[PDB]
Amino acid sequence: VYFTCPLTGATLRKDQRDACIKEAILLHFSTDPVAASIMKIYTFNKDQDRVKLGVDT
Amino acid sequence: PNRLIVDEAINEDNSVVSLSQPKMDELQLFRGDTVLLKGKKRREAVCIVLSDDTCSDEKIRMNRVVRNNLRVRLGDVISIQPCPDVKYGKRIHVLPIDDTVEGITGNLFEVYLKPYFLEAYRPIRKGDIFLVRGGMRAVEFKVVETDPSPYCIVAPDTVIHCEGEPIKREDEEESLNEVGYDDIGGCRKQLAQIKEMVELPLRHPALFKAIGVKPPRGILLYGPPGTGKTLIARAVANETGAFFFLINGPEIMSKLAGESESNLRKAFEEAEKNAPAIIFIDELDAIAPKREKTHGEVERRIVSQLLTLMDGLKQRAHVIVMAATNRPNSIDPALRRFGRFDREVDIGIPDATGRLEILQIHTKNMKLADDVDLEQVANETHGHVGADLAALCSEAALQAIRKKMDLIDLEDETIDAEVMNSLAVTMDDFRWALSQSNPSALRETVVEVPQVTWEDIGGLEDVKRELQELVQYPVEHPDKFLKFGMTPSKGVLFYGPPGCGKTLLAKAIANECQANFISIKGPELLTMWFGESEANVREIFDKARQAAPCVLFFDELDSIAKARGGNIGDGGGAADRVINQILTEMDGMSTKKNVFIIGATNRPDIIDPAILRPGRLDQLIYIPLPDEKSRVAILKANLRKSPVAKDVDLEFLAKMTNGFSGADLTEICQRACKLAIRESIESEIVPEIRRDHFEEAMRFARRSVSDNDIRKYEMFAQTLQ
Amino acid sequence: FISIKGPELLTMWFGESEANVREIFDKARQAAPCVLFFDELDSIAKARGGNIGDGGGAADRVINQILTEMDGMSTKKNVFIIGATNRPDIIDPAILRPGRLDQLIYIPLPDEKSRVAILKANLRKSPVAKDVDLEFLAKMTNGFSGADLTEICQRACKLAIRESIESEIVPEIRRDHFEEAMRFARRSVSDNDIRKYEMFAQTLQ
Amino acid sequence: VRAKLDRQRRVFQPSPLASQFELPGDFFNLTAEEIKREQRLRSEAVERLSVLRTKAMREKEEQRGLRKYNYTLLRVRLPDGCLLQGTFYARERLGAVYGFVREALQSDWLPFELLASGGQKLSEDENLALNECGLVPSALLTFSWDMAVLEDIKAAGAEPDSILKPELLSAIEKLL
Numbered sequence A: 001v002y003f004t005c006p007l008t009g010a011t012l013r014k015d016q017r018d019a020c021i022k023e024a025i026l027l028h029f030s031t032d033p034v035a036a037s038i039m040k041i042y043t044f045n046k047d048q049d050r051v052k053l054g055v056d057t
Numbered sequence B: 001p002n003r004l005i006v007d008e009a010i011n012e013d014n015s016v017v018s019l020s021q022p023k024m025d026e027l028q029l030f031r032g033d034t035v036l037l038k039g040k041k042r043r044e045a046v047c048i049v050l051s052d053d054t055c056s057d058e059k060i061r062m063n064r065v066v067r068n069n070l071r072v073r074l075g076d077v078i079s080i081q082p083c084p085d086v087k088y089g090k091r092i093h094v095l096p097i098d099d100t101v102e103g104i105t106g107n108l109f110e111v112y113l114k115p116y117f118l119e120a121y122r123p124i125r126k127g128d129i130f131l132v133r134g135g136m137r138a139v140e141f142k143v144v145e146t147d148p149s150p151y152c153i154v155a156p157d158t159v160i161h162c163e164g165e166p167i168k169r170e171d172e173e174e175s176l177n178e179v180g181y182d183d184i185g186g187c188r189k190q191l192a193q194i195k196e197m198v199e200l201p202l203r204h205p206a207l208f209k210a211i212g213v214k215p216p217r218g219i220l221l222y223g224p225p226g227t228g229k230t231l232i233a234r235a236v237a238n239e240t241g242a243f244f245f246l247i248n249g250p251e252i253m254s255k256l257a258g259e260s261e262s263n264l265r266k267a268f269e270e271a272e273k274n275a276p277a278i279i280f281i282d283e284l285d286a287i288a289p290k291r292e293k294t295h296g297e298v299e300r301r302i303v304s305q306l307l308t309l310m311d312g313l314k315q316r317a318h319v320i321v322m323a324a325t326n327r328p329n330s331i332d333p334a335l336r337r338f339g340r341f342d343r344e345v346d347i348g349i350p351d352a353t354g355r356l357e358i359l360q361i362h363t364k365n366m367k368l369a370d371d372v373d374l375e376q377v378a379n380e381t382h383g384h385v386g387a388d389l390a391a392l393c394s395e396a397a398l399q400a401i402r403k404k405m406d407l408i409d410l411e412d413e414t415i416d417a418e419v420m421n422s423l424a425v426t427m428d429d430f431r432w433a434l435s436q437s438n439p440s441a442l443r444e445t446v447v448e449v450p451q452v453t454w455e456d457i458g459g460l461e462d463v464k465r466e467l468q469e470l471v472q473y474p475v476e477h478p479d480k481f482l483k484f485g486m487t488p489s490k491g492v493l494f495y496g497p498p499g500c501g502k503t504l505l506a507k508a509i510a511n512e513c514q515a516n517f518i519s520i521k522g523p524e525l526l527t528m529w530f531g532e533s534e535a536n537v538r539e540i541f542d543k544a545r546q547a548a549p550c551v552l553f554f555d556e557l558d559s560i561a562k563a564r565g566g567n568i569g570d571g572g573g574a575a576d577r578v579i580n581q582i583l584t585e586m587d588g589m590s591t592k593k594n595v596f597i598i599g600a601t602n603r604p605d606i607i608d609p610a611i612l613r614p615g616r617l618d619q620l621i622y623i624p625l626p627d628e629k630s631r632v633a634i635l636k637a638n639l640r641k642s643p644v645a646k647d648v649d650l651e652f653l654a655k656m657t658n659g660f661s662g663a664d665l666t667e668i669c670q671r672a673c674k675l676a677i678r679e680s681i682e683s684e685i686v687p688e689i690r691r692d693h694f695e696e697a698m699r700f701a702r703r704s705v706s707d708n709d710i711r712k713y714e715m716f717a718q719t720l721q
Numbered sequence C: 001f002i003s004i005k006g007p008e009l010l011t012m013w014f015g016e017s018e019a020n021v022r023e024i025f026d027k028a029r030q031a032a033p034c035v036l037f038f039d040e041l042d043s044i045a046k047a048r049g050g051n052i053g054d055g056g057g058a059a060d061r062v063i064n065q066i067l068t069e070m071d072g073m074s075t076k077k078n079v080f081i082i083g084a085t086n087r088p089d090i091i092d093p094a095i096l097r098p099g100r101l102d103q104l105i106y107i108p109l110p111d112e113k114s115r116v117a118i119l120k121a122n123l124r125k126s127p128v129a130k131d132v133d134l135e136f137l138a139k140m141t142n143g144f145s146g147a148d149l150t151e152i153c154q155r156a157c158k159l160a161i162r163e164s165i166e167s168e169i170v171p172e173i174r175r176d177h178f179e180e181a182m183r184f185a186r187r188s189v190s191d192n193d194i195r196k197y198e199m200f201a202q203t204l205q
Numbered sequence D: 001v002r003a004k005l006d007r008q009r010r011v012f013q014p015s016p017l018a019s020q021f022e023l024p025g026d027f028f029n030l031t032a033e034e035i036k037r038e039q040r041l042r043s044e045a046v047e048r049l050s051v052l053r054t055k056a057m058r059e060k061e062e063q064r065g066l067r068k069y070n071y072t073l074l075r076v077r078l079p080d081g082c083l084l085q086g087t088f089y090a091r092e093r094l095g096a097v098y099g100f101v102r103e104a105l106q107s108d109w110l111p112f113e114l115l116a117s118g119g120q121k122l123s124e125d126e127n128l129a130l131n132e133c134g135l136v137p138s139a140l141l142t143f144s145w146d147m148a149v150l151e152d153i154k155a156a157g158a159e160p161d162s163i164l165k166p167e168l169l170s171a172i173e174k175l176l
Ligand SMILES: Nc1ncnc2c1ncn2[C@@H]1O[C@H](COP(=O)(O)OP(=O)(O)O)[C@@H](O)[C@H]1O
Pocket: B183, B184, B185, B186, B187, B225, B226, B227, B228, B229, B230, B231, B350, B358, B361, B385, B386, B387, B388, B390
């Protein structure tokens, strides 16, 4: 199964998805630290109900 | 690789086969792909592959139409070869088989072939035989020309042609109207039991050829007439390919001495000459009745000839003899000795599910109207056997035929196919036929899986768990029972006030086990006592074994003690003829027979104490009157099938009805239901049960169990804990 | 050993087939040396109402055939006949005359040392922890019969098995299982019956 | 941020040579080894029907079968003999399959229908998941043009000899 990384355009497999996106978000801190931390809060955390409570607080 | 064993199919469609999903994964084919199947005699068939959650990994499920085209039978092996290159067809020429088109004429394309292929995209190969049903006739067709070769997919743009005389069937090919396993509805288990007993000695006889142990040679099928005993024997012979030789009592008994034995032994000789073969002896009790019941030379001489022929089967390799009787005890006991007819199967009476399956089979060719519901029919046809459901469908068809044929006015040697295609059978014709039909098995005991489930019983949460543990623990921890030297119990007695769910508990555990429930009621125990026919108790316990897995429920164990007085008392005591035989039979039941024996009594102080001795009903459960929270649960269960208004306060009722049994709470619910119906009828000449209906019901409903009766049960319960 | 149980004597009585008694005694003559045991000799009297019943006597068809066969049986056949009853007050006294079951043995409820022996014997089929004080249990079960000590042994076993199964959702029966069993186990012979049994045995001297 | 599932759209051409294979007569002779598995399953089937077991035990047998698949691979059979293939999540909506096909068709505006493997019509307006439509973990769908446009195509004498864009057909692969 193949997937496209929306941050880099790289072609990934089912196992490589989180590894490439997480790396792209951590690298993005050199361009826009606020946008990079925003992507990290929603992307790295699997529990979205806690993310919504954290962001609202 | 890519070779699977042929099995039965569930999907009724004739263009599909089912594989287990992992095999489709190994073959890299998808649901809906077209594949070729390689069969015997250099033949092949083309079909669509699907999958389900029931097919075994190493099997392919295909129906009779596909199996016949491959010239294969159940248990054979075929190869699967995907053929994605198949193209859409342009023109296919299809002609009927003469054996199935007789007495009928008309435009067969419009009636059969057109709707059959209409947006179906069925694969078709030259030479294939396929079946189309309709107009109360089963018509099969042969494909004689395909523009592409040798197969293609039919499409809406494919020309379907049909001109020419019907085709004469090849003698090597069997008709699809022959009885097979797909023609048998209920009693599926009994068919599976026969499969094991019959396929082995006929397909794999060498297991017994070299070894000194001989195979079972006879299988005795028994049960009420019209349950399919002959149908099963014929279907098994046809499905396995063995030659079927038919014998019946009247045919042999109508002959004179010498002629009768000659015909009997001739059939055995032919079975060997054409082996493998199955000999089916119908009405075994007619050819071989109990010896003490007859003194005629022919009646005894034909039995001696049968006994010798059965014993001679040791040399007649690959031949098995099946027989049918009404009851296992109506035949000369010599036939039931080891060897000969040592194995037997109880066919029984189809239950509500089996009756629905039987009706669906007989209606396969019938055009049912949208208002017809065969499940409603199956629920009403209590006491009917397959022979009666076949008559029911025929009568419903004839009623529809008369109503429309009187208007059609077609008087000729043949019937138009179009007018039969437009002839529908309505629910009124089934209801009419039900009023004219009379069940042939209304006197025999009906045994089936009950419909009562745990959701229907209020309260008793600990009893529900206990009954489940008594079923799973003896097999989930056999090492712990053996370690401590404990024998698992095989039964329980329920005691306490009436109307608390004693019967429901026995049914609910049978339901959740999907086990047969055998109900013995007071009047039956009293009938045996009064009529000095306690010997019939053995038949009850023998039914439980044959019905296993089952729950054998002996209700009203005090029925005879009360009949002899109970509160006053005649010249007898606690023991009687019937309970003594019941106790004797219980001592012969093993824990491995999958029979759970449950008793119930409303007066445990007057039941023969022997019933609670070790080895009998070793478990003892008290069922008290429901408490407040249980009474609410009972009211909700009793009202589960009716609309109840939001103003009805079921907790308020439960708080008042402190001394009421579950049966007494039902009277309240049913009274409120009747009152709601009365009001609705008055307004027509309201749609839900209102509090006013329950409050009025409370004016009449009373507790059936008094405070003194409660203490009577407490004293017994505390005595034995 | 020929075991004729209550239900067999009742079957012959209920069906008026006392002729079968001759076949039972014929087994004893042909099976010799043998012991012919007639259990629950009072099963018919109890099946006739026991304490009340009808106005008739203790004699009936089955026992009369038994008495007849006993009179026709010689000691030279090496056959010894044993009876048992738990209600001797309603047994046909003819069975105790010379030539029949003329010997009488009273079997009282076991005493303290016997009850311990019974508990130890019944527990030979299961693992039992060393913490179980069988003498203490016997001291409490003063009015219990041997059959009642069996129920205690089995009840404590049932508890040990249930707990073992639950632990996976133990290796032996613990003192707690016997002490818990004592909370439900009861004597089957009441104090009124104990005095009746002793007074009857005393009357016979 | 989640990686977008790449449809990996492909068109395939079957090779008639894949269907040409002859079997020796002995290939249909059931072995003693197969007979042992077949006879074992015969006895086990009777034992399954025979046992008195509560629903909790029955669950353990069902549970063994149940939980494997979370993806699907779909293929569409086109009137022109080509096979259009692409990948989907098992919970994807039927509307994604329509869109997937429309992006591949030479004329994405021309009304068409997709039929399931059993002949059941899949409606574009019915927002059901592929695991609810019976198209998981794989299925072949049948492509047909709407009847309204087929009547105009036939009446005009136009042979619909190309279903897909030349942009995808130039990369057609043979089935292996
Ligand atoms: N279990 C069943 N399933 C399907 N059809 C049945 C069943 N039992 C009986 N029938 C039908 O009822 C009829 C039975 O008559 P017959 O074949 O003579 O057998 P028998 O009289 O031994 O029951 C047949 O038409 C058969 O199809």
